[PDB]
Amino acid sequence: MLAKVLKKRGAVLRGDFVLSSGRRSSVYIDMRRLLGDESSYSVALDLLLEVGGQDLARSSAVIGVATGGLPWAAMLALRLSKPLGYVRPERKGHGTLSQVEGDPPKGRVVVVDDVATTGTSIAKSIEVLRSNGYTVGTALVLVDRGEGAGELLARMGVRLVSVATLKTILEKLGWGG
Amino acid sequence: MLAKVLKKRGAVLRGDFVLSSGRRSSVYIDMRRLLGDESSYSVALDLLLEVGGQDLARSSAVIGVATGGLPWAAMLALRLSKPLGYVRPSQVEGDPPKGRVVVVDDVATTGTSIAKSIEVLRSNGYTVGTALVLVDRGEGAGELLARMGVRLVSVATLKTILEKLGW
């Protein structure tokens, strides 16, 4: 049950915010706050391994969506004694060529991010992976905002799996709205 | 044992580079390539833990330098059952408990990225006296960090690596 751990670490904060989607929100989500407490990130890692299931367990490598999903991907890779790789969003118009940092061996991988929003950040990582000789059909996140990410990824042959949805977390915490 | 691991993963590249120090060099070290091979990063982690010694073991948290030193810091934190935090060279992402922490990065050149992280850590109440990296290029990082009261420890210097590889 992430909800409890999230509240404890302030990973779910009450307030008055504006999101990049343009929507006004009474909640700010920050999964990074779970990293500063072994008790908290361990619970998160165990849940990620659980939902990742066999896809993650048999993956030739774990790929993180830099930055956000990088610590999680690195920790999962170490727990599974598997190769790690990651893709970062590069500044545009500078002549930069994308790459899968870490250069894990070609094969089937699972991409990992902390929070799924629109799904575009994950989609970009998938395109880089597929263009560089990797195969990927699963994206794993801790929290899915439930705002179109799954549908967008489904349209490009990728199944999004999450430990929890924002809606479920807010309900459990008796957030109101 | 790090030199052989680097060679096997093609972490040492040749070319015409302009280092962050402003000096030109024909060598670039990409430590990220070790992450794509479990046998390689496990060795690197073992060496980091060895060189980190008690300073790393007694820390209240391991702090990584986004993005380069982030996987290493995250893996060290997990292996040490310690909190993780990181700075994007402001707040310390992760909000680890206040106390004496150790900053970790993959390669130290000018030491600027590490210095920035230390500045942010201290502004937020943390203390730091040690910085840990896999490779120190000897491009001023040790001096810069010493100036701000931080001792830089490295698994190896680029000089040692190049000599071992016969470069």
From Swiss-Prot, chain B:
Orotate binds at residues 109, 137. Coiled coil: none annotated. GO terms for biological process: 'de novo' UMP biosynthetic process; pyrimidine nucleobase biosynthetic process. It is an enzyme of class 2 (transferase). It comes from the Archaea. Pathway: Pyrimidine metabolism; UMP biosynthesis via de novo pathway; UMP from orotate: step 1/2. Gene3D superfamilies: 3.40.50.2020. This is Orotate phosphoribosyltransferase. It comes from Aeropyrum pernix (strain ATCC 700893 / DSM 11879 / JCM 9820 / NBRC 100138 / K1).
